[PDB]
């Protein structure tokens with residue numbers, strides 16, 4: 133029987149749950165009889181991204197519905213969807229391509245989780261919770277509720293829930309301090325960069341075995357750059373609720389997981405609207421999508437030399453922006469050092 137703290141054991145059980153992975157695939161309208169969890173592979177996902185790229189080239193060039201049909205059908209051949217004996221919906225627009233690119237990004241983390249469960253050894257004398265914990269190659273410690281770091285984190289949660297995200301409220305259940313093996317070494321060139329910020333990154337519970345094992349990653353070269361607002365990078369928010377929406381929790385599944393990462397932003401490339409960029413302009417280290425609302429800059433505090441933007445939301449003074457709240461994007465995976473993982477209870481008001 134595991135000697136791991138009970139919150140850590142509950143975390144491992146949550147993230148390695150196979151029925152949750154199947155549920156996530158059904159939510160995507162994936163046909164599990166044709167493409168079960170076990171048959172998902174990086175080469176099939178990468179091929180589907182390439183087809184999505186072809187569909188997008190065809191839509192941006194103003195092709196007809198009759199022209200696009202063959203391209204759209206190719207995507208469904210690679211990733212079989214649950215439509216029985218009916219014609220699947222046509223992928224003939226930017227929105228349809230973006231939704232599919234987002235689904236494939238998730239499949240990449242689901243594939244990692246399942247490959248970890250299937251690729252090791254079987255020993256009945258060991259607690260499977262300890263076996264699965266070791267597969268993450270991440271030290272996970274419970275942060276003491278009465279500590280200085282816990283007070284800072286709870287204040288960040290309490291102060292940055294947007295009024296426009298008021299259909300639910302958040303309750304912090306557990307705060308974990310995380311250290312992925314090799315991440316500190318990888319982060320070393322960026323450890324003293326200016327503008328290092330502690331930012332949020334939400335994801336579905338089914339992504340976390342992938343995130344803890346492999347870290348936050350960028351969609352592969354096959355992925356269409358136009359399927360993401362600021363291109364292919366790692367996206368973060370300074371408002372807890374903006375990132376909590378990416379957990380995709382519901383009344384039927386109200387427990388989510390959210391990360392706090394130290395992000396080396398350096399010289400920010402400030403943008404108000406979509407820019408499907410491949411690379412950053414010379415001298416820039418990140419993109420800052422300018423929101424209408426920002427946490428109050430005078431309330432910014434420091435936690436182990438990193439800026440924590442935990443002030444309540446105020447007007448940024450930015451006009452004519454596509455964004456209600458800020459977002460930060462890095463285009464090199466080495467610019468992120470994951471620090472904390474929070475288990476949240478979503479209390480739905482609807």
Ligand SMILES: CCc1cc2ncc(CN3CCN(c4ccc(C(=O)NC)nc4)CC3)cc2[nH]c1=O
Nearest residue numbers: 237240333334349350351352367368369375378459
């Ligand atoms: C503005 C705040 C914000 C934005 C946000 N945007 C997207 C996502 C979804 N997430 C993107 C990365 N994704 C990949 C998985 C594997 C690979 C891989 O294996 N690549 C090689 N790549 C990509 C998994 C799905 C979550 C988000 N959370 C937030 O808080």
